[PDB]
Amino acid sequence: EDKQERANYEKLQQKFQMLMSKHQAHVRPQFESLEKINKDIVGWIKLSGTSLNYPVLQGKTNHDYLNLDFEREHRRKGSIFMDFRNELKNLNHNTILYGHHVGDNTMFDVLEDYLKQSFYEKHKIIEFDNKYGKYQLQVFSAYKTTTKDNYIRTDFENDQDYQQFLDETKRKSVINSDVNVTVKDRIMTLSTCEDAYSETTKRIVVVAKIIKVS
Numbered sequence: 001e002d003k004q005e006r007a008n009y010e011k012l013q014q015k016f017q018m019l020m021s022k023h024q025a026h027v028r029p030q031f032e033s034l035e036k037i038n039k040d041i042v043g044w045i046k047l048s049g050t051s052l053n054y055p056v057l058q059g060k061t062n063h064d065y066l067n068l069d070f071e072r073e074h075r076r077k078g079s080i081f082m083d084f085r086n087e088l089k090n091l092n093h094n095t096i097l098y099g100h101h102v103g104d105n106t107m108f109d110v111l112e113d114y115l116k117q118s119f120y121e122k123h124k125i126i127e128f129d130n131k132y133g134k135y136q137l138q139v140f141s142a143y144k145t146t147t148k149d150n151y152i153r154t155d156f157e158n159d160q161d162y163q164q165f166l167d168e169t170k171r172k173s174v175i176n177s178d179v180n181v182t183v184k185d186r187i188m189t190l191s192t193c194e195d196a197y198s199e200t201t202k203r204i205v206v207v208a209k210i211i212k213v214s
């Protein structure tokens with residue numbers, strides 16, 4: 001169970017790695033393949049040298065995969081899942097991703113590490129891939145938060161309105177980044193999540209500039 005869970009992710013991690021090697025350049029086939037397992041698997045997130053290396057889910061709601069893994073089995077750690085509002089094909093300004101932080105170096109435990117500049121330095125880039133392209137996540141802000149909204153905004157009203165969001169995001173960061181974001185760029189937010197009804201004013205958020213490298 002608690003070790004079978006690592007078995008599954010191990011299997012899958014190794015599976016994904018070979019797919020990303022067989023087809024290489026092409027990404028369309030790697031996910032058409034993962035979709036056989038579960039049609040709700042819409043992407044992959046990986047950070048080399050860490051345990052952050054999982055498939056990303058998406059359901060009709062934001063609690064669909066809270067306590068479910070990629071093969072739809074109940075698990076306290078659920079899955080890493082995209083906001084039910086976000087778009088796979090054509091990204092929104094801000095694509096949100098959520099995942100647990102139970103403290104055993106799995107799922108989104110690694111987000112906490114980004115609160116240290118040192119760690120940020122050694123890990124400025126996170127890989128994100130899906131059925132439509134390869135992307136590179138350029139981390140530029142990491143912080144702890146008590147609020148439950150605002151940083152959960154998919155699309156925006158206008159450049160002025162969006163400009164503010166980027167500015168606050170930057171102001172809230174507890175680490176210095178040499179990246180440069182603008183109302184032009186699209187961003188991705190990584191946030192931790194507690195079980196449903198599991199009150200906790202402590203959340204960790206990581207925001208990055210989304211670069212399509214394909």
Ligand SMILES: *[C@@H](C(=O)O)[C@H](O)C(=O)N[C@@H](CC(C)C)C(=O)NCCCCNC(N)=[NH2+]
Pocket residue numbers: 060061062063084098099148152191192193194196
């Ligand atoms: C954990 C998190 O990181 O926020 C989890 O996704 C969550 O608490 N989400 C919010 C909802 C949106 C950010 C508005 C929440 O109210 N928690 C319960 C699940 C949300 C209910 N379902 C939907 N579709 N809003």
